[PDB]
Amino acid sequence: HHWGYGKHNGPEHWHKDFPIAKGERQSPVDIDTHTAKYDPSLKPLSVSYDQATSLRILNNGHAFNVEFDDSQDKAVLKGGPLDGTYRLIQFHFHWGSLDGQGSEHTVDKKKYAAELHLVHWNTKYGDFGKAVQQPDGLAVLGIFLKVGSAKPGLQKVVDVLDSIKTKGKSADFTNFDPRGLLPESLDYWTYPGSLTTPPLLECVTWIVLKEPISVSSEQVLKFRKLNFNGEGEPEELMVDNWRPAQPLKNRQIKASFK
Numbered sequence: 001h002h003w004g005y006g007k008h009n010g011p012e013h014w015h016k017d018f019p020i021a022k023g024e025r026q027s028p029v030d031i032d033t034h035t036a037k038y039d040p041s042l043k044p045l046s047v048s049y050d051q052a053t054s055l056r057i058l059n060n061g062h063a064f065n066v067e068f069d070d071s072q073d074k075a076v077l078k079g080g081p082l083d084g085t086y087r088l089i090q091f092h093f094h095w096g097s098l099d100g101q102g103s104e105h106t107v108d109k110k111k112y113a114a115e116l117h118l119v120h121w122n123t124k125y126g127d128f129g130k131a132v133q134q135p136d137g138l139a140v141l142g143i144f145l146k147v148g149s150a151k152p153g154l155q156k157v158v159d160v161l162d163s164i165k166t167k168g169k170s171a172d173f174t175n176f177d178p179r180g181l182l183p184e185s186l187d188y189w190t191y192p193g194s195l196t197t198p199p200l201l202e203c204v205t206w207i208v209l210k211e212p213i214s215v216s217s218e219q220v221l222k223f224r225k226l227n228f229n230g231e232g233e234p235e236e237l238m239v240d241n242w243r244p245a246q247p248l249k250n251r252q253i254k255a256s257f258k
């Protein structure tokens with residue numbers, strides 16, 4: 001009886017195995033745009049993905065991860081609210097069963113169809129496992145998805161999904177360029193938070209871009225054909241793999257833009 005996104009194992013149950021679920025800096029949160037304050041001291045984001053080396057794509061039973069070679073400073077995130085260098089390890093998405101839900105963060109209570117998380121770890125801690133034990137261990141760049149025009153740079157991801165339909169399946173996924181998933185603007189909100197899945201560790205500096213990317217209905221429909229289950233098990237569609245907004249508590253969300 002492991003955690004998931006069903007009625008009997010979903011987000012409202014997680015606290016029983018992971019008491020930090022009710023902690024002081026949990027994610028995601030609602031971003032109240034009128035309360036978020038412009039912070040002129042915040043720097044522009046530095047997203048350096050030109051040397052990114054993708055390796056593999058994995059259905060882990062709660063989403064799919066596109067994994068990168070993080071044994072050197074290839075693809076890194078710096079600047080903004082961050083001190084030091086954060087290495088890209090993987091990206092994944094959260095999405096809904098319908099276009100009107102799927103994102104984890106919300107903006108003035110608006111839910112987007114999906115949310116992309118580019119996960120980076122602070123290289124002062126040496127490896128990812130050590131980094132998640134630190135309050136400034138990770139930086140996750142969050143990007144909203146809305147349904148409209150297709151995102152050409154997403155299609156290579158979409159088309160490999162039939163080969164990793166079920167939990168535990170992986171496929172080679174080399175030479176994928178994550179720059180093709182970014183929006184035009186790097187304007188962002190930032191706040192201190194947590195992993196949005198168990199173990200829910202409070203180790204993340206969240207950087208959530210204001211500008212959503214557009215993906216087509218056909219693209220998101222292919223996300224929704226994935227399975228939570230393993231091969232040969234009763235089919236349960238991988239949809240609604242998002243945690244709802246958590247209490248903001250003693251936190252301020254800062255904006256990089258006026």
Ligand SMILES: NS(O)(O)c1ccc(OCc2cn(-c3ccccc3)nn2)cc1
Nearest residue numbers: 117119128129132140194195196197199
């Ligand atoms: N959704 S999110 O972007 O917040 C997000 C990002 C990263 C996550 O990592 C889970 C994880 C894996 N490990 C681990 C550590 C050492 C060895 C093996 C696994 N620890 N936490 C979860 C959610």
Ligand SMILES: [Zn+2]
Nearest residue numbers: 092094117196
């Ligand atoms: Zn995530």
